[PDB]
């Protein structure tokens, strides 16, 4: 018997909603974002949930991480949660996007709100862009195209960008239940469903790539879309 | 917008499999004491999961935190599995558990397991025993009587045993969904449904009144059965 409960969609965003409702919101400029984003990008299907957003600004603001690098800015959403998580550090946040419309609007949206002492968007291919970073990063947000994700993580670990008490998080890493198997998201709307069955095959090698590499503890924590957690094993103790 | 996947009962446990398949394990030894649990004990449906174990696991190595309280040891697993995640550190890890049988059980995986007394098992209902507690925790894992749970983060707080940057994980919040409504849980069993509702109404309240709490920052994580995550306000 399984960690997971099962829910009907209706019952699925109810329990959403609950948890929305006993959890501390996000701040009234990210919502006025959201909801900005939303309309001016109709059903897009790409930004993440409010709260997915909670757990964003949450968990930068447990851990106090220094630096933050995200793969895939869209509107700016998931950086400012970074941006409202890390105040008391002022972190820089490195957020990369190759979209240029998305950049255009991530840029408007920094420069509305203010964050552009920390926030730095870098444009272009993350397959380009990524490997030219430098140092390390204590958080890093792996929500970009998933067919790039096995090659996102494996220049972060070769590279060092991920630091020795970092973390790297990687959403939708279930694409809807599609990665587990085709019968796996029966409530999916089709028009939808071979992108995500695509998704689904690119990131059953990655996951299954992660457990194949001996400097890495990995867990596939089924929250969301599903959220991979990425960590350098620990050092080594003795001589 | 959704941030729960709706799954039927036989593809939520697949699922649950293919996260265990793509996740590290947890060691021979604590799935030995997991499958003995399953075996020895007509309730073992209390104990935790093996992906939750992972979980638990991976939570310790990543935090690192130096002192562990958990409330609720019933077998041990959720103690051996933050002892098996704190071996670099040697973090102690305080237990509580108030039933008889199982203080027995657990101390007897205790001390097959091979842990040292960094492992400390306090007997007694948690609600006497927990006020008695000095310091502080970095990490404390609320995991008992679910009526309870208020009581049991009231006395954490106004004590300090939580450390300015520890975390307290609330597990099963959800009691099987019927925290958020009675209908949320059609798939369970009629004999346990009393036991679940009645645990969800006191964890509803729970839920509310951590949003009271000036103190705090929350989170109701819907993961597993609902975890909630509680740190101090910066
Ligand atoms: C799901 S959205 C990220 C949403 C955002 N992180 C949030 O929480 O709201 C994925 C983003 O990655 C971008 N993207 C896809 N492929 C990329 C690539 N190869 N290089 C850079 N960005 C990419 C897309 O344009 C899109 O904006
Ligand atoms: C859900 S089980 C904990 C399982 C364990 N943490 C694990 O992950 O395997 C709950 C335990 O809390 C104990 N318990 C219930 N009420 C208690 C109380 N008031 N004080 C101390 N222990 C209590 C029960 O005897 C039971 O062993
Ligand atoms: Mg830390």
């Not at 690098?69 to 490195?94: F, H, N, Q």
């Not at 920390?118 to 490997?131: D, F, M, S």
Request: proline fraction near 5%; aromatic fraction near 10%.
């Amino acid at each position: 018997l399984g960690s997971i409960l099962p829910f009907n969609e209706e019952t699925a965003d109810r329990v959403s909603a609950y948890c929305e409702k006993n959890s501390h919101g996000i701040p009234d400029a990210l919502v006025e974002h959201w909801e900005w984003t939303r309309t001016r990008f109709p059903d897009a299907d790409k930004m993440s949930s409010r709260l997915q957003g909670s757990w964003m600004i949450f968990t930068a603001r447990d851990r106090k991480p220094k630096r933050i690098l995200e793969i895939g800015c869209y509107s700016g959403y998931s950086a400012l949660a970074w941006y409202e998580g890390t105040r008391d550090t002022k972190a820089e946040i490195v957020t990369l996007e190759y979209s240029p419309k998305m950049i255009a609007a991530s840029r408007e949206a920094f420069k509305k709100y203010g964050v552009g002492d920390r926030v730095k968007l870098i444009e272009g291919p993350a397959e380009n862009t990524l490997k030219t970073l430098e140092g390390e990063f204590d958080l890093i947000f792996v929500d970009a195209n998933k067919d790039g994700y096995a090659g996102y993580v494996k220049t972060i670990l070769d590279q060092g960008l991920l630091s020795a008490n970092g973390i790297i998080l990687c959403d939708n890493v279930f694409a809807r239940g599609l990665t587990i198997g085709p019968d796996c998201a029966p409530w999916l709307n089709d028009h939808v469903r071979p992108y995500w069955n695509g998704c689904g095959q690119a990131l059953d090698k990655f996951s299954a790539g992660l457990m194949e590499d001996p400097r890495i503890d990995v867990l596939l924590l089924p929250v969301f879309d599903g959220v991979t957690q990425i960590r350098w094993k620990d050092g080594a103790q003795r001589a």
